[PDB]
Amino acid sequence: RPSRVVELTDETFDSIVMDPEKDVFVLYYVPWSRHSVAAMRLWDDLSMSQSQKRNHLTFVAARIDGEKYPDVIERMRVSGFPTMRYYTRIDKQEPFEYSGQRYLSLVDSFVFQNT
């Protein structure tokens, strides 16, 4: 699909997610799960939707493979997959957790409400 999602690693995670000029919505996934696959597609679509909205220069959709980077899953206190947390410009230490249904319109509305 079209995507502008950034694939993180343990080396690049803080530089992208904790950037104070960006509002960064992170998907933590494991690739062998169908639910995480679904969430990956949603994240591609979220990246494209946000690229056409007013916050396109500050919003970043990013993802990290928790099987490949269990260090990050431990450091960020993620306890299952998929997990979606929004690390806004000012709120890097108490990100907003998305627990709603996994459809683009609802995730776009959570972005707008929490930015």
Q: Which amino acid is at 85?
A: R
Please give, one letter per residue, the 3-state secondary structure of the chain.
CCCCCEECCCCCHHHHHCCCCCEEEEEEECCCCHHHHHHHHHHHHHHHHHHCCCCCCCEEEEEEECCCCHHHHHHCCCCCCCEEEEECCCCCCCCEEECCCCCHHHHHHHHHHHC
- 104-114 and 34-51 helices cross at what angle (nearest 10)? 60
Resolution attained, angstroms: 1.5
| Experimental method of this PDB entry | X-ray
- The fold adopted by the segment(s) 1-115 is Glutaredoxin (3.40.30)
Distance from C-alpha of 41 to C-alpha of 99, rounded to nearest angstrom: 17
The residue whose two tokens read 């996994």 is: 102
Cα-flanking dihedrals φ and ψ of residue 71, to 5°?
Answer: -55, -45
Return all residues near 38 (Cβ < 8 A) that are at least 6 apart.
102
- Burial class of residue 74 (count of CB atoms within 10 Å of its CB; 0-12, 13-18, 19+): exposed
Domain boundaries in the chain?
1-115
What is the greatest pairwise CA distance in the chain?
Answer: 34
